[PDB]
Amino acid sequence: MIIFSGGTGTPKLLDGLKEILPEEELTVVVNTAEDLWVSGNLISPDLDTVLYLFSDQIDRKRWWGIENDTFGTYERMKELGIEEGLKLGDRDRATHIIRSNIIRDGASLTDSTVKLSSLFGIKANILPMSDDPVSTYIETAEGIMHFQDFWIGKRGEPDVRGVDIRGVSEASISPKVLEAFEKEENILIGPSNPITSIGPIISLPGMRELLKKKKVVAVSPIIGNAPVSGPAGKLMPACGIEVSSMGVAEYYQDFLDVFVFDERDRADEFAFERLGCHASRADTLMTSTEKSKELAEIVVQAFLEH
């Protein structure tokens, strides 16, 4: 199975999915539009969260970075009054370095990910959406900046007026992802930000037509009129998208077969049918692995049913 992952939502679901399906059969296509070179090394946050999740080292408190990691370099630089831009732990930096040394030798982002997977003892097939650079810029009132500066540097406080994913049009779907699509038929879109987390992946050239030829299931990241977390509350409207389960559904309308939204919503299931997709409800608020596992089972059943 192929899972489109980005943000913190999907990795939480993958946390449960990896408990009901053989790891080898799990192919995670990760968003790279957040990738940034920092302190000489490439940081692929969405790629690393999945790598750490599948290697039991993810920090389940923030759902990014390594559990109880040290910050020697980060602290020393802070004493000198220098800010790396994000809290880079020492063990986490090793991943950036190992990945970047591979890239500096000529290998691709996919190559480094495959290697990191072996080093971490991961059986799942973790792959970046593309081997090409893609960056997400948020057009706010205070000017145009990178997603990082906006979400981390500004705590997402600024007001968003637009979103720009640069390079996506010029990018190419990873060769190994196209290979996976050649042997797969089920695609799961995790409950993440449709604009900045998932959008980049589906925005790649040839992806929309590729999804149309497959069974696609998606889980709503919104439980009502606002997402469980993330800057989805601002980024979505700024793109002319209603912040609701119905909005997300309409967004994937072109290729969505099955949709799964939260119980609390209790929305017109007949309305979803109008969009051309079968919808069902479940508890999408994953407060623990067990809750994630229960949502993963409902999702699997969604693929099995006809």
Add this chain to the structure above:
Amino acid sequence: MIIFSGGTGTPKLLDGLKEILPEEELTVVVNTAEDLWVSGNLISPDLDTVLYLFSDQIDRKRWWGIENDTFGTYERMKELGIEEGLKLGDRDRATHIIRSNIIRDGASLTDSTVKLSSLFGIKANILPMSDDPVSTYIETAEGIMHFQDFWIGKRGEPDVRGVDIRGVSEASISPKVLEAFEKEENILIGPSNPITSIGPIISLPGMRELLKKKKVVAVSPIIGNAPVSGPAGKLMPACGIEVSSMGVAEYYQDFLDVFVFDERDRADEFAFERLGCHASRADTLMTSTEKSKELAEIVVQAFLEH
């Protein structure tokens, strides 16, 4: 006073010199032929050792790196079986990052040294010999490799048959070093390897002729027929130079004015006179700060006696 520094000998002597002269008056011109980009960031080992020595953070046990530094990142990669090429501490890596972010922004190695000096609160004037890239390669029976590969990777075991300082002829003396020379009259060559620690500096185009117009004092790094530490024993003969204080003096013959070698030698003062330089002996074996101080005093006396 200007001091040419490289290796571990000169910084040990600087440790004593900074105790008997005002630090603001010490300008250190540092070797950069050992500089390497490692794990995404530039490492200038000779520059850093001096930076750490003048900021009271040098590790006096190995005379490189920071005292009681942590190795979170280094250890993590070791567990994964990946070697960076040398033991990089977390605090030390901060220095490489701060320096590299500056170079990445478009500034020079000298510019980054000025900034790091401010951050560290150093009064001494630390300058790299040149802003241009220079790399020391060691020609062995097993093949040609970088100094680091030979000294750290192979532990200095290979049989040395040649030394190649690449880029030195294309490199230029740092403009700030030329400016410092314009105002200085006394130049000191610390007791370091004359081939790879001092050699690169005096090999820069125009440097030799520049040294002739000044009062130069050198301290022999050889006691007897071998150096106190380092691979000078292999590198010197591999360049047709006899491993002795006399060999060192002949190497600097073109500009040496005063030579200081160890007492354990008792060599013909007529021999040195023939080379055109006043010579005297002293205990050049610096086993402690006090011994370095004692040797630094004799060195200052050498400049005073003229």
